């Protein structure tokens, strides 16, 4: 099975109307280090909910 006519650039754009990425709504701010992080994820320096959970 294969196309009988070349689909247009218009049809191609309509199909991709749902391919748009959804940016992260908002980052959480740690209460101790004040860093930004994904909610429910530890920070880049190992903080989570105001606690140094990993020492690296």
């Amino acid at each position: 099975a294969v196309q009988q006519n070349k689909p247009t650039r218009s049809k191609r754009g309509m199909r991709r109307s749902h391919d748009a990425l959804t940016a992260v709504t908002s980052l959480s701010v740690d209460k101790t280090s004040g860093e930004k992080h994904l909610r429910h994820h530890i920070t880049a320096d190992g903080y989570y909910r105001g606690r140094k959970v990993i020492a690296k």
Binding site: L38, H40, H41, I42, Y48, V53, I54
Partner: protein, 125 residues
């Protein structure tokens, strides 16, 4: 359908899952904190925490039964000599899953899992 079924397949056969969680449980009690994917971490709870509950009653029967689940005497020794007494008063929930970033190689959701009493005094041994 999947109604009321439990346990993840993790894209492995049964014998591979059993071997993997046996190794992963041994690594968890040896280092007290490891980093793995979030699905593997959640299933590891149903493996390692029953071992800690088993290690609360020291006996040759429990030790052998724990050895059958881990196949490592160094692991069994630490379970009954360290982790047993350390969790003698805690009623379940010996682990803690902390979500972290995504693995660079495949964008897998990673997570730390650690024993709850891995405090600043663990550096003694």
């Amino acid at each position: 359908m999947r109604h009321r079924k439990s346990g993840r397949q993790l894209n492995r056969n049964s014998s591979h899952r059993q071997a993997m969680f046996r190794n992963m449980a041994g690594s968890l009690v040896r280092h007290e904190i490891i980093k793995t994917t979030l699905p593997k971490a959640k299933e590891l709870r149903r493996v390692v925490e029953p071992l800690i509950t088993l290690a609360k009653t020291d006996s040759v029967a429990n030790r052998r039964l724990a050895f059958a689940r881990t196949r490592d005497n160094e692991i069994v020794a630490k379970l009954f000599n360290e982790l047993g007494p350390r969790f003698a008063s805690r009623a379940g929930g010996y682990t803690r899953i902390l979500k972290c970033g995504f693995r660079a190689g495949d964008n897998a959701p990673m997570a730390y899992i650690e024993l709850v009493d891995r405090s600043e005094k663990a550096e003694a041994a």
